[PDB]
Paper text:
The Thoeris defense system triggers abortive infection (Abi) upon phage detection. The ThsB genes encode Toll/interleukin-1 receptor (TIR) domain–containing proteins responsible for phage detection, while the ThsA gene encodes an Abi-triggering effector protein. Two ThsA effector variants have been reported: a silent information regulator (SIR2) and SMF/DprA-LOG (SLOG) domain–containing effector (ThsASIR2-SLOG) and a transmembrane (TM) and macro domain–containing effector protein (ThsATM-macro). Collectively, our biochemical and structural data demonstrate that the nucleotide signaling requirements for ThsASIR2-SLOG and ThsATM-macro effectors are distinct and suggest that ThsATM-macro effectors can trigger Abi via membrane perturbation by a mechanism that involves nucleotide-induced oligomerization of its macro domain.
The Thoeris defense system in [name] CFT073 consists of a TM-macro ThsA effector ([name]) and two TIR domain–containing ThsB proteins (EcThsB1 and EcThsB2). We expressed and purified the macro domain of [name] (EcThsAMacro; residues 62 to 278). To define the structural basis for ADPR binding to EcThsAMacro, we crystallized and determined structures of this protein in ligand-free state and in complex with ADPR via soaking, at 2.7- and 2.1-Å resolution, respectively. EcThsAMacro exists as a stable dimer in solution, as characterized by size exclusion chromatography–coupled multiangle light scattering (SEC-MALS), and forms a symmetric u-shaped dimer in the asymmetric unit of the crystal. In both crystals, the symmetric u-shaped dimers stack against each other, forming open-ended higher-order oligomers. In EcThsAMacro, the dimer-dimer interfaces are predominantly composed of residues from the β6-β7 hairpin and the β3-α2, β8-α6, α5-β8, and α6-β9 loops, with a total buried surface area of 1060 Å2. In summary, our data support a mechanism where ThsATM-macro exists as an inactive dimer and subsequently oligomerizes within the membrane upon nucleotide binding. Our data also demonstrate that ThsA macro domains exist as stable dimers in solution and further oligomerize upon ADPR binding.
Numbering used by the authors:
A (entry chain A): 65 to 278
B (entry chain B): 65 to 271
Write the structure that this text describes.
Amino acid sequence: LSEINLDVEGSIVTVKAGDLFRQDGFKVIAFNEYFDTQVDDVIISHNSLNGLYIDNYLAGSVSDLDHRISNHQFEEDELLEVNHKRKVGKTQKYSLGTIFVNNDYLLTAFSKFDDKNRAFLTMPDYLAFLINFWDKVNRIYAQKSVSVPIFGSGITRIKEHKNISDEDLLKIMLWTFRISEMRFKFPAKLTIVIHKDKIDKINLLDIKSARNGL
Amino acid sequence: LSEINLDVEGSIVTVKAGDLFRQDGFKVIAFNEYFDTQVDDVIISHNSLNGLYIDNYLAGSVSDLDHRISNHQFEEDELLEVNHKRKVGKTQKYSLGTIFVNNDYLLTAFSKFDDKNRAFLTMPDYLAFLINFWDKVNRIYAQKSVSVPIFGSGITRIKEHKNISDEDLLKIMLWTFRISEMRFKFPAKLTIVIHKDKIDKINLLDI
């Protein structure tokens, strides 16, 4: 079984094996809190989806995107404090769930970076990113297709849940999307794209319950 | 029906109709971020579970409790800022999920208060409180009985979710608890208590 459609409180949500970059419509790439763009296996890694987007899929130079983000008008709440101590990498912190749209890609600030440029989140941070993100897309991209990976199944560490399964992350994503879409009467059309090789690990049948919040 | 036991990650979580104050073991009362104690229908309502506890069940004086909390030594993360502008009530703010023990009662910092002193939470606040709260009780009160109400099903307003239902709050509580106990060999023994007048609108059968 490689695809499932579920009714989540009135909206059809699709979970399917595939390649995110082959999806038509809006595609979500998970960046870090600084919206770093330097793929040198030091800040951003070449195996991440964040570095893979920049390496082979970004339109234009990395230097052009940096200036588009630097000269972008983020809400007063989406802008955080500036880490002047950051040695290697950008300095402006952004609040999780922040979205910078770039052609048909939604670059979202997902993971945090510690003093040792390690990608991490706490479970409260993870659930808070999801709720904020789901709010922004259901509000801004109502009725538009949005395709997302399994947030946090890559190198991002969820503190104290290092062994969390992609199947648990997937259920959480559906629980938090339900909480969000239930306040919107025309939410986004959500597709969760699972890497074709990882789909054999996940039992899509263990997830259907999350469409009702359990 | 009125009671169900759920096999959550191997642990049993009881959901029952009844009166929280009649439970054996630990009973959780939700306070605000300042741990205020002035039941006066402006900063703490006399109808809230917070008010009923202080008015009808607090063993000791409110002053004994305020001072005991003041002189209590929380963690460094649990102690946040100090609203000096605070026109009324305590000024020390605590991080949601902080617990102060008071006999067989766990007084936990749950709701936030605004300028008008409205009890409120963002949905990310609510989920963060639960994860931070569950982790504390699963670590400190492992194998001990902890009874709780449905957090958020009272005067507290979850922003953008003014009309969230008690059944939906119960569902959030149950899967945020699962995430928590996941990382504990011996979690706490959780009993979620619903008020008899609300088990009609909630179908524990569904769940």
